[PDB]
Design an enzyme around this catalytic site. Structure first.
Site, PDB file in Angstrom:
ATOM      1  N   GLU A 165       0.812  -1.212   0.000  1.00 34.73           N
ATOM      2  CA  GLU A 165       0.000   0.000   0.000  1.00 34.73           C
ATOM      3  C   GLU A 165       0.848   1.266   0.000  1.00 34.73           C
ATOM      4  O   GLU A 165       0.531   2.225  -0.709  1.00 34.73           O
ATOM      5  CB  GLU A 165      -0.942   0.022   1.211  1.00 34.73           C
ATOM      6  CG  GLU A 165      -2.059  -1.020   1.168  1.00 34.73           C
ATOM      7  CD  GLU A 165      -3.189  -0.650   0.215  1.00 34.73           C
ATOM      8  OE1 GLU A 165      -3.107   0.412  -0.429  1.00 34.73           O
ATOM      9  OE2 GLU A 165      -4.151  -1.433   0.101  1.00 34.73           O
ATOM     10  N   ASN A 206      -7.967   9.303  -5.448  1.00 39.39           N
ATOM     11  CA  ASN A 206      -8.849   8.355  -6.114  1.00 39.39           C
ATOM     12  C   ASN A 206      -9.686   9.068  -7.167  1.00 39.39           C
ATOM     13  O   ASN A 206      -9.819  10.292  -7.163  1.00 39.39           O
ATOM     14  CB  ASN A 206      -9.741   7.636  -5.098  1.00 39.39           C
ATOM     15  CG  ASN A 206      -8.934   6.864  -4.061  1.00 39.39           C
ATOM     16  OD1 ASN A 206      -8.018   6.116  -4.409  1.00 39.39           O
ATOM     17  ND2 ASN A 206      -9.253   7.062  -2.784  1.00 39.39           N
ATOM     18  N   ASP A 242     -12.852   9.193  -7.619  1.00 40.00           N
ATOM     19  CA  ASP A 242     -14.046   9.848  -7.097  1.00 40.00           C
ATOM     20  C   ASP A 242     -13.744  11.097  -6.280  1.00 40.00           C
ATOM     21  O   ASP A 242     -14.685  11.741  -5.800  1.00 40.00           O
ATOM     22  CB  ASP A 242     -14.845   8.862  -6.245  1.00 40.00           C
ATOM     23  CG  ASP A 242     -14.000   8.210  -5.166  1.00 40.00           C
ATOM     24  OD1 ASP A 242     -13.713   8.866  -4.143  1.00 40.00           O
ATOM     25  OD2 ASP A 242     -13.612   7.037  -5.347  1.00 40.00           O
ATOM     26  N   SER A 278     -11.854  11.224  -3.394  1.00 39.40           N
ATOM     27  CA  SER A 278     -11.298  10.902  -2.089  1.00 39.40           C
ATOM     28  C   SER A 278      -9.779  10.741  -2.191  1.00 39.40           C
ATOM     29  O   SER A 278      -9.193  10.782  -3.276  1.00 39.40           O
ATOM     30  CB  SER A 278     -11.938   9.623  -1.545  1.00 39.40           C
ATOM     31  OG  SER A 278     -11.778   8.534  -2.447  1.00 39.40           O
ATOM     32  N   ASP A 287      -6.309   8.540  -0.271  1.00 35.55           N
ATOM     33  CA  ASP A 287      -5.772   7.521   0.623  1.00 35.55           C
ATOM     34  C   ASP A 287      -4.519   8.058   1.308  1.00 35.55           C
ATOM     35  O   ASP A 287      -3.670   8.677   0.658  1.00 35.55           O
ATOM     36  CB  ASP A 287      -5.415   6.252  -0.158  1.00 35.55           C
ATOM     37  CG  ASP A 287      -6.640   5.514  -0.709  1.00 35.55           C
ATOM     38  OD1 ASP A 287      -7.796   5.909  -0.418  1.00 35.55           O
ATOM     39  OD2 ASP A 287      -6.436   4.523  -1.445  1.00 35.55           O
ATOM     40  N   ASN A 330      -8.669   5.644   3.528  1.00 30.60           N
ATOM     41  CA  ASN A 330      -9.440   6.427   2.567  1.00 30.60           C
ATOM     42  C   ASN A 330     -10.320   7.466   3.265  1.00 30.60           C
ATOM     43  O   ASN A 330     -11.117   7.127   4.148  1.00 30.60           O
ATOM     44  CB  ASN A 330     -10.316   5.465   1.758  1.00 30.60           C
ATOM     45  CG  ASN A 330     -11.006   6.131   0.562  1.00 30.60           C
ATOM     46  OD1 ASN A 330     -11.244   7.340   0.544  1.00 30.60           O
ATOM     47  ND2 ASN A 330     -11.321   5.328  -0.449  1.00 30.60           N
TER      48      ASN A 330
HETATM   49 NA    NA Z   1      -4.919   1.506  -2.016  1.00 24.54          NA
END
Ligand code: NA
Ligand SMILES: C[N+](C)(C)CCO
Ligand SMILES: C[N+](C)(C)CCO
Ligand SMILES: [Cl-]
Ligand SMILES: [Cl-]
Ligand SMILES: [Cl-]
Ligand SMILES: [Cl-]
Ligand SMILES: [Cl-]
Ligand SMILES: [Cl-]
Ligand SMILES: [Cl-]
Ligand SMILES: [Cl-]
Ligand SMILES: [Cl-]
Ligand SMILES: [Cl-]
Ligand SMILES: [Cl-]
Ligand SMILES: [Cl-]
Ligand SMILES: [Cl-]
Ligand code: NA
Ligand code: NA
Ligand code: NA
Ligand code: NA
Length: 129
Positions: A35, A46, A48, A50, A52, A59
């Site tokens: 990650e 992301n 949309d 958002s 991370d 998120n």
């Molecule tokens: Na991820």
């Protein structure tokens, strides 16, 4: 901060992640590698809108607040910037709520696709725990 492999395992161990909800320590180390590459300052946007955040790429759609994800939730009651600190306490506390939410560690897409079902013990092999 870019953790070492065994350094991060020790940190996760003392914060109570080993066997937390049945997930051995190696599952948590493997997830962080894929990650965040062990970097506490990792962020990724992301599609949309958002974002991370941090060592386990938590998120803002559900778990933290950054003021720029309209209609999102803050279920961990924490600013997303607190998940980027060199001290992993905040991420670990938020990770525990995430894993207890019903889907287990499948909430981390990189865990389901790259760690699930593999020999995760090799990630803690040789570590002073
Ligand atoms: Na991820
Ligand atoms: C399961 N989600 C995190 C997607 C929503 C919780 O209300
Ligand atoms: C599992 N790896 C071999 C990739 C890391 C060292 O243990
Ligand atoms: Cl860093
Ligand atoms: Cl190390
Ligand atoms: Cl401690
Ligand atoms: Cl396990
Ligand atoms: Cl393990
Ligand atoms: Cl994180
Ligand atoms: Cl909003
Ligand atoms: Cl909320
Ligand atoms: Cl906030
Ligand atoms: Cl720490
Ligand atoms: Cl589970
Ligand atoms: Cl989630
Ligand atoms: Cl060992
Ligand atoms: Na490594
Ligand atoms: Na949010
Ligand atoms: Na706002
Ligand atoms: Na295996």
């Amino acid at each position: 901060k870019v953790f070492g492999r065994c350094e991060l395992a020790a940190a996760m161990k003392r914060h109570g992640l080993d066997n937390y909800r049945g997930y051995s320590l190696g599952n948590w180390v493997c997830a962080a590698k894929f990650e965040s590459n062990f970097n506490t300052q990792a962020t990724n946007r992301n599609t949309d809108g958002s974002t991370d955040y941090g060592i386990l790429q938590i998120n803002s759609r559900w778990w933290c607040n950054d003021g720029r994800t309209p209609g999102s939730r803050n279920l961990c009651n924490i600013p997303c910037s607190a998940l980027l600190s060199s001290d992993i306490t905040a991420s670990v506390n938020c990770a525990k709520k995430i894993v207890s939410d019903g889907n287990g560690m499948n909430a981390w897409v990189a865990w389901r696709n790259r760690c699930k079902g593999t020999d995760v013990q090799a990630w803690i092999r040789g570590c002073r725990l």
